[PDB]
Amino acid sequence: MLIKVKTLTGKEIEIDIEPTDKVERIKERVEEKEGIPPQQQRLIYSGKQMNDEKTAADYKILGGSVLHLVLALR
Ligand SMILES: [Cl-]
């Protein structure tokens, strides 16, 4: 399942995931291509901060779905 992860400055990245994949894995995919540690990532879908322990299916994510990535300093 190909989804988009968009940032405020406009750049997008395609991430391949599955309905059973946990949000933590999505962050790990972003880390693979961007080098941003999962702990510094905040993924938002439909105005909701995505929980690391939950799965893509819990947010009803489909092909083409756009997630929003923002930095969260720790
Ligand atoms: Cl940001």
From Swiss-Prot:
Region (Interaction with UBE1C) residue spans: 70-72
Molecular function terms, GO-annotated: protein tag activity; ubiquitin protein ligase binding
Post-translational modification as stated in the protein's UniProt record: Cleavage of precursor form by UCHL3 or SENP8 is necessary for function.
Main location: nucleus
Residues annotated with N6-acetyllysine modification: 48
Cellular component GO terms held in the UniProt record: cytoplasm; cytosol; extracellular exosome; glutamatergic synapse; nucleoplasm; nucleus; postsynapse
Tissue expr: Highly expressed in heart, skeletal muscle, spleen, thymus, prostate, testis, ovary, colon and leukocytes.
Site feature (Interaction with UBE1C) residues: 8, 44
Subcellular location: Nucleus
Residues recorded with modification (Microbial infection) Deamidated glutamine: 40
Example of a GO biological process term: regulation of proteolysis
CDD domains given in the database record: Ubl_NEDD8
Outcome recorded upon mutating residue 11 to A: Decreased interaction with B.pseudomallei Cif protein, leading to decreased deamidation
The organism's place on the tree of life at top rank: Eukaryota
Similarity remark: Belongs to the ubiquitin family.
UniProt subunit comment: Interacts with AHR; interaction is direct. Interacts with NUB1; interaction is direct. Interacts with ESR1.
Role, per record: Ubiquitin-like protein which plays an important role in cell cycle control and embryogenesis via its conjugation to a limited number of cellular proteins, such as cullins or p53/TP53. Attachment of NEDD8 to cullins is critical for the recruitment of E2 to the cullin-RING-based E3 ubiquitin-protein ligase complex, thus facilitating polyubiquitination and proteasomal degradation of cyclins and other regulatory proteins. Attachment of NEDD8 to p53/TP53 inhibits p53/TP53 transcriptional activity.
Protein name listed in UniProt: Ubiquitin-like protein NEDD8
